[PDB]
Amino acid sequence: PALTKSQTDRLEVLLNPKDEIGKPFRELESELLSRRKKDLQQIYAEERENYLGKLEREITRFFVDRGFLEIKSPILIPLEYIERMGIDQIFRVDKNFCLRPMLAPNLYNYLRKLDRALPDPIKIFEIGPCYRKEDGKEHLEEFTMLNFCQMGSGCTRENLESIITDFLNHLGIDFKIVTLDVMHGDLELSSAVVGPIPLDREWGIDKPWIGAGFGLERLLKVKHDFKNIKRAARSGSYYNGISTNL
Amino acid sequence: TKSQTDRLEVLLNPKDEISGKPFRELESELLSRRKKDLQQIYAEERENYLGKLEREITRFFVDRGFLEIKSPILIPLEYIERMGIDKQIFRVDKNFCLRPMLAPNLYNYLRKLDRALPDPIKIFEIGPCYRKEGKEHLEEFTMLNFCQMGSGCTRENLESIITDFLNHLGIDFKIVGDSCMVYGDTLDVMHGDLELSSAVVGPIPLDREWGIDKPWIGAGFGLERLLKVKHDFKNIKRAARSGSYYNGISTNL
Ligand SMILES: Nc1ncnc2c1ncn2[C@@H]1O[C@H](COP(=O)(O)O)[C@@H](O)[C@H]1O
Ligand SMILES: Nc1ncnc2c1ncn2[C@@H]1O[C@H](COP(=O)(O)O)[C@@H](O)[C@H]1O
């Protein structure tokens, strides 16, 4: 015969990058299902930790060990911050609030405020959900952002390039630095910047600083060689990359 | 005065000795204590209270055989209509909304995982939940929901897990019977007269709405309330995600 679209996409979903796997569709599907169920049975028997959660924790350990303060800010923020971010893809909620499309606005308020109680340099970071009406191969609507930044005198690209390297070296991911765009192949892993920037004026930040934002789903995409980033995202359709529609 | 009192309670900490000293002098002493606390934290801690508790709770459950779940926060509006709600919902756009609870997604995982895992199916999620709201309620809170599905799951197992859980977190509690129409004979996990969690033993009518036929037990705890008890916070806003507090310390210094 020849697989119909519906059957190819179906095999696609049940397929795993590590799969060793002609044969008719029903046999291919039956065998792949059997494997996926076993893969799930293994995770349940040995691991049990969710990829998204586990990586978040590992990333948190790294930064917390390197002197960064772990921030947990609101996901539902005032629409003002979006304006204040010089934004003239957003999920609006109610009257003047929305779902944070980035971690920057809330981190800015922490840099400013903390800058009055903590000695330079101020090192903070946050890992969490961000939303953007979106190319499900690199982009999701609900993704997880890692944002870190250090504020104080002397902060430079060098400093920045240092953390990014120790970081990705730690995670165990290849990369290529090329504002900076931490690339892995041609997949953008992160967007980093060396302060100060005009926008700093909009939030009361008057010291130089360095920061980078990474998408944990892309880190996972690369770490587990997923074709579709959705396999790394929050969903009820995949668990640690294993289809749940079995 | 009134306004002075308010900004004083904001800088006042639970562990402080807290009468007649002039305001300026009182505010000053608190501002320095707060920066000191915030400085000790930045030097020896650095872990968000919410994040740390989540990580501790996660280890507790993964170690007892529960699978860790991370599901969408932005869920389909129908899941709400499906839970039996026709409320304080943050609708976003056409037909989506910020989950007001974890039940729907966990219901789906139970249904799907039952086709691949041997009973008992044990899962749990920890994450953001939303409800439009004061001294005990946040609009944006953090929920922990765990449940086991499979025959055998009795009220006994439920009370036993909660007990090991709260014993591990070192949180004194009382479990009182509660009864309502939709959920039936429920379990209230109390600390004084503050509710820590609602615990239910399935099956219940609502189940058929999600493709679940088997019995189960589950309970949901709000982390902020767990924090509020552990740290003896007066206002639950001390533990919530916010730009005004950090581990219960005012950031306006
Ligand atoms: N829509 C998205 N879906 C998934 N990840 C994203 C998305 N947008 C951004 N990211 C991740 O966050 C990084 C920085 O995004 P940004 O600086 O806002 O352009 C990107 O390089 C990705 O690592
Ligand atoms: N608005 C809220 N703010 C903080 N915690 C909450 C809130 N709603 C529920 N919780 C916590 O979650 C538990 C169960 O909530 P429910 O979904 O109504 O059964 C409550 O007893 C609290 O422990």
- DSSP of A90-116: --EETTTEEE-S-SHHHHHHHHHHHTT
Contacts of B120 (CB under 8 A, 6+ apart): B148, B149, B150, B152, B153
CA distance B150 to B215: 6
Contacts of B85 (CB under 8 A, 6+ apart): none
Q: In terms of DSSP bridges, do strands A242-243 and B96-98 run parallel, antiparallel, or are they unpaired?
A: unpaired
Please give the residue of chain B at the shortest CA–CA distance from A89. B93
CA distance B145 to B125: 5
Nearest alpha-carbon partner for A50 in A206, A245, A236: A236
CA distance B158 to B161: 5
Chain A residues close to B51, C-beta within 8 Å:
60, 70, 72
How many residues in chain B? 253
> Per the structure block, which two tokens stand in for B233?
């916070």
**CA–CA distance from B207 to each of A188, B54, B110 (Å)?**
43, 28, 11
The residue behind tokens 């308010």 is B6
> Per the structure block, which two tokens stand in for B147?
């449940």
Contact B72 A142 (CB under 8 A): yes
CA distance B72 to B77: 13
CA distance A219 to A223: 6
CA distance A68 to A65: 7
CA distance A69 to B158: 36
Resolution of the determined structure in angstroms stands at 2.3
No. of H helices and E strands in chain B?
7, 12
Region at B202 (left for phi over 0; alpha for psi -120 to 50; beta for the rest): beta
Contacts of B202 (CB under 8 A, 6+ apart): B149, B153, B212, B214, B215, B216, B217, B218
- Secondary structure of B57-114 in the HEC alphabet? HHHHHHHCCCEEECCCCEEECHHHHHCCCCCCCCEECCCEEECCCCHHHHHHHHHHHC
Please name every residue paired with B185 in a beta bridge, in sequence order, or none if there are none. Answer: B179
A114 neighbors A124 (Cβ within 8 angstroms):
yes
- Which residues in chain B are immediately followed by a break of C to N over 2.5 Å? 18, 86, 133
Most distant CA pair in chain B, distance: 68
Please, is A170 exposed, middle or buried when counting C-beta atoms within 10 Å of its C-beta (0-12, 13-18, 19+)?
Answer: middle
Q: Does A42 contact chain B (CB < 8 Å)?
A: no
AA identity, residue B149: M
CA distance A202 to A111: 13
CA distance A98 to A79: 6
3-state DSSP assignment of residue B201: strand
Domain A1-48 class in CATH = mainly alpha
Whether the ω angle into residue B76 lies within 30 degrees of 0, i.e. cis, is no
B217 neighbors B153 (Cβ within 8 angstroms):
yes
A216 neighbors A127 (Cβ within 8 angstroms):
yes
What is the Cβ-side half-sphere exposure of residue A159, based on CA atoms within 13 angstroms?
A: 19
CA distance A158 to A144: 26
CATH second-level architecture of A49-246?
Answer: 2-Layer Sandwich (3.30)
**Backbone torsions φ then ψ of A146, nearest 5 degrees:** -110, 120
Contact A60 B50 (CB under 8 A): no
CA distance A102 to A152: 23
Please, is B25 exposed, middle or buried when counting C-beta atoms within 10 Å of its C-beta (0-12, 13-18, 19+)?
Answer: exposed
What is the Cβ-side half-sphere exposure of residue B20, based on CA atoms within 13 angstroms?
A: 0
CA distance B8 to B252: 12
Nearest alpha-carbon partner for B104 in B145, B65, B141: B145
Classify domain B1-46 by CATH number.
Answer: 1.10.287.540
B122 neighbors B67 (Cβ within 8 angstroms):
yes
Contact A52 B70 (CB under 8 A): yes
Please report the number of interchain residue pairs, chain A to chain B, with beta-carbon separation below 8 angstroms: 136
CB-ligand 2 contact for B215 (6 Å cutoff):
no
Q: Which of residues 68-97 of B touch A (CB under 8 A)?
A: 68-74, 90-93
CA distance B167 to B246: 26
Q: In terms of DSSP bridges, do strands A242-243 and A238-239 run parallel, antiparallel, or are they unpaired?
A: antiparallel
AA identity, residue A158: E
> Per the structure block, which two tokens stand in for B14?
């639970």
A192 neighbors A212 (Cβ within 8 angstroms):
yes
| Domain chopping of chain B, boundaries | 1-46, 47-253
3-state DSSP assignment of residue B191: strand
Domain B47-253 class in CATH = alpha beta
CA distance A110 to B157: 43
What spacing in Å lies between the alpha carbon of A68 and ligand 1's midpoint?
22
> Per the structure block, which two tokens stand in for A246?
């079995």
